[PDB]
């Protein structure tokens, strides 16, 4: 049995501009096994049209997926990505930062 | 196009 924690990074497809539509991405990679739970949050509660890539892996067999929904950033709407896994005792929430 | 031939372990 080997198990690896997912590297999470949440971000937008294009640089954030208030009022313009965009795509909010949560990219989980480097984990094993494949069973992972990922949501995107708008002020801390789940977004409800989230799509994800088709599962794939790297040379070290670690898995990666990209969860993404579509959104319009404003000045004080807080977006985040919540990720759960076997390797995580509690769901890890990573907040979105227009500058990372 | 994927391979046509599969073999078991």
């Amino acid at each position: 049995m080997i198990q690896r924690t997912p590297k999470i990074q949440v971000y937008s497809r294009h640089p954030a501009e208030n009022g313009k539509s965009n795509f909010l991405n949560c990219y989980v990679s480097g984990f094993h096994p494949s069973d992972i739970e990922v949501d995107l949050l708008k002020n801390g509660e789940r977004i409800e049209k989230v799509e994800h890539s088709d599962l794939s892996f790297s040379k070290d067999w670690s898995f990666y997926l990209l969860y993404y929904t579509e959104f319009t950033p404003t000045e004080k709407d807080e977006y985040a990505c919540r990720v759960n896994h076997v390797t995580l005792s509690q769901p890890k929430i990573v907040k979105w930062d227009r500058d990372m | 196009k994927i391979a046509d031939y599969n073999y078991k372990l």
Binding site: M1, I2, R4, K7, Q9, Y11, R13, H14, P15, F23, N25, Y27, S29, G30, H32, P33, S34, D35, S53, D54, L55, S56, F57, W61, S62, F63, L66, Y68, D99, M100 | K1, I2, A3, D4, Y5, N6, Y7, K8, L9
Partner: protein, 280 residues
């Protein structure tokens, strides 16, 4: 570690056993370089191989019927494999286990065969892998050595070599012209810099590389031209979701010493490294 090929087609297969009941979950994904074009998901409702690139929708019913017949054959193999490996390593029915397989081919500049590969994994660990001469196998384990013997006797490598040097190469060549605008493209990275005052004596300079393809990218921070291989924070290259990739790097500079710092972007579409400074 060897030289890159000009282009590559790769197929990725994952089977995950779900104990209790239900056939294991099967996902198939095919890439040309860093662009996905085919998908098959056992949990999806289509139960067919589906296009995920516009240049592969050209192909008619014989292509899709064939790929769908052969993708389900892959599914069935890993259903047997998952049972074989659980009997090879002697593990209970209650456990959930994973089988990964990947194969594909690279071509050089001339678009002729350069390299082929076909590798398996059980639960993330290397299991069996076909050698670089496409004639022998490498067993990572004594259980995988049983498969090595079974496959060497059945002459499995001769059939796989036929595909890698044959069907793999010629059909990748055809995908390259069918999707020249997407696959034979080079997108130079859009680059910019940001500045965030950490405190009174330190600030952060983040070096951005956005909207580039292929994904191969090198960003490096220098002070007085000296690479800061330590004290720099680098993030793994991520997909933008539009067919391009992103990456950035950050370094913490003492206030008033920004001018001494340079970020550099190296990409396929940049013949010489591109220098990035802090200039508001």
């Amino acid at each position: 570690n060897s030289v890159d090929g000009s282009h590559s087609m790769r197929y990725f297969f994952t089977s995950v056993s779900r104990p209790g009941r239900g056939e294991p979950r099967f996902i198939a994904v095919g890439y040309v370089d860093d662009t996905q074009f085919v998908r098959f998901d056992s949990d999806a409702a289509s139960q067919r191989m589906e296009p995920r690139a516009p240049w592969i929708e050209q192909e008619g019913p014989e292509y899709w019927d064939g790929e769908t017949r052969k993708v389900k054959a892959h599914s069935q193999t890993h259903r047997v494999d998952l049972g074989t490996l659980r009997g090879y390593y002697n593990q209970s029915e209650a456990g959930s286990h994973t089988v990964q397989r990947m194969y594909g081919c690279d071509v050089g500049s001339d678009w002729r065969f350069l390299r082929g590969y076909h590798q398996y994994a059980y639960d993330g660990k290397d299991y069996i892998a076909l050698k670089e001469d496409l004639r022998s196998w490498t067993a990572a384990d004594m259980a995988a050595q049983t498969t090595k013997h079974k496959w060497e006797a059945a002459h499995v490598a001769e059939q796989l070599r036929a595909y890698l040097e044959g069907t793999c190469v010629e059909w990748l060549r055809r995908y390259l012209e069918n999707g020249k605008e997407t696959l034979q493209r080079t997108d130079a990275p859009k680059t910019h810099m940001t500045h965030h005052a950490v405190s009174d004596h330190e600030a952060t300079l983040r070096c951005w590389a956005l909207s580039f393809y292929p994904a191969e990218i090198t960003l490096t921070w220098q002070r007085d031209g000296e690479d800061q291989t330590q004290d720099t924070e680098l993030v793994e290259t991520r997909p933008a979701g539009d067919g391009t990739f992103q990456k950035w790097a950050a370094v913490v500079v003492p206030s008033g010493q920004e001018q001494r710092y340079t970020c550099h972007v190296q990409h396929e579409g940049l013949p010489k490294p591109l220098t990035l400074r802090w200039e508001p």
